Design a protein around this ligand. Structure first.
Ligand code: HEM
Ligand SMILES: [C-]#N
Length: 373
């Protein structure tokens, strides 16, 4: 893999994210670093509104630009949703909206908190000389005390990273296919499956660091966007940058290139059709870092692993291939149980389009199995 911005140990996540910005931006940092407080004491909005329009020209490298995106991102969410009880601002102050939109255009991402922001770039290791384990990690920004943002963001991060171990073998896969190296292809496929089976394990941690009510009633609120959202019908107006209000989708792990990449790799057509699920997954790529979406399509232009495995009456291969597909459905099936627990139940103390979306994606994955009939 070339510079598709994919680290060997961390995958799609940003390696060693930047924690501090140039003093020139201390005003931004302060708000971001004290969001839980400012929000609760009800002085957040007033503070954003007192901000001077800062220029983004002093954000020289990528990482510093990403940090910035995170800060302005978190701030924008806090501002729009407030204490997150129903009182929402429909207009984002030009002093903040401008830099944010300019930085966004520069990074080729929409002006709203995105997965690549609050997960991929929102972390740090407590002890630099220790492994990447929950215990040795922390997020950079949170919305409100007890919103379980650490648990959510980090467990996603950790799953993201577990899946990163397979990304590195993708090249091996394609090489083997043209070099007609059957034993190499088989090895590779199983390795991938193994990594996807380990990611599921990592996923279990979600129960240990995220409480259903807190998640459903708080975090979920701040991660909401303004596309097809009843309380922001026509979107959000980025004062001083755009004429009319713009609609954008909230942050969601659905923006992770990880799962999409494997669906591609394995020839699963999540994106095909005119269906609602397909449109959503296709649309979410717009929310992924440009480098990453480039990676996703470069894969799409490679020869099909599925067609290859099928064209070879080789059980070993078919099975190894199914192993990977089986791993995905397993992850998704587990993900459903999780939504049930962290959304369905909490909301019961309409939202079925949710379950049908997920089940359609899952179903599509299953359908790709080879030796099922
Ligand atoms: C608190 C736990 C979690 C909840 C409540 C949750 C909820 C949801 C919901 C409601 C969707 C549907 C679309 C949307 O609104 O964005 C979704 C999609 C998705 N989530 Fe989660 N999620 C959770 C944890 C995770 C974790 C830890 C991962 C792992 C990185 C993950 C990966 C995905 C993916 C890839 C999709 C998109 C569709 C697909 O490929 O199947 N989620 N999630
Ligand atoms: C999934 N967020």
């Amino acid at each position: 893999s070339k510079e598709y911005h994919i680290d060997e140990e961390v995958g799609f996540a940003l390696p060693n994210p930047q924690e501090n910005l140039p003093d020139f931006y201390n005003d931004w940092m302060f708000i971001a670093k004290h969001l839980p407080d400012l929000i609760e004491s009800g002085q957040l909005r007033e503070r954003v509104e007192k901000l001077n329009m800062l220029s983004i020209d002093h954000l020289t490298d990528h990482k510093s630009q990403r940090l910035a995106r995170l800060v302005l991102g978190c701030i924008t969410m806090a501002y729009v949703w407030g204490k997150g009880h129903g009182d929402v601002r429909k207009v984002l102050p030009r002093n903040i909206a401008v830099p944010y939109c300019q930085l966004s255009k520069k990074l080729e991402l929409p002006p709203i908190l995105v997965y690549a922001d609050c997960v991929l770039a929102n972390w740090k290791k407590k002890d630099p000389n220790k492994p990447l384990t929950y215990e040795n990690m922390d997020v950079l920004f949170s919305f409100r005390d007890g919103d379980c943002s650490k648990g959510f963001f980090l467990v996603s991060l950790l799953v993201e990273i577990a899946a990163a171990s397979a990304i590195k073998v993708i090249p091996t896969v394609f090489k083997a296919m043209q070099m007609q190296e059957r034993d190499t292809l088989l090895k590779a496929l199983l390795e991938i499956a193994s990594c996807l089976e380990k990611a599921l394990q990592v996923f279990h941690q979600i129960h240990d660091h995220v409480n259903p009510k807190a998640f459903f009633s708080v975090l979920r609120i701040y991660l909401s966007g303004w596309k097809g959202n009843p309380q922001l019908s026509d979107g959000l107006v980025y004062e001083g940058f755009w004429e009319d209000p713009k609609e954008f989708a909230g942050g969601s792990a659905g923006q992770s290139s990880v799962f999409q990449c494997f669906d591609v790799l394995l020839g699963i057509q999540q994106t095909a059709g005119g269906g609602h699920a397909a449109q959503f997954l296709q649309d979410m790529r717009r929310y992924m870092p440009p480098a990453h979406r480039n990676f996703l399509c470069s894969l799409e232009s490679n020869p099909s692993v599925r067609e290859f495995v099928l064209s070879k009456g080789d059980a070993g291969l078919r099975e190894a291939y199914d192993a990977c597909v089986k791993a995905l459905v397993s992850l998704r099936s587990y993900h459903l149980q999780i939504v049930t627990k962290y959304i369905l139940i909490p909301a019961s103390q309409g939202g079925t389009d949710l379950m049908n979306f997920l089940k359609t994606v899952r179903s599509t994955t299953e359908k790709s199995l080879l030796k099922e009939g």
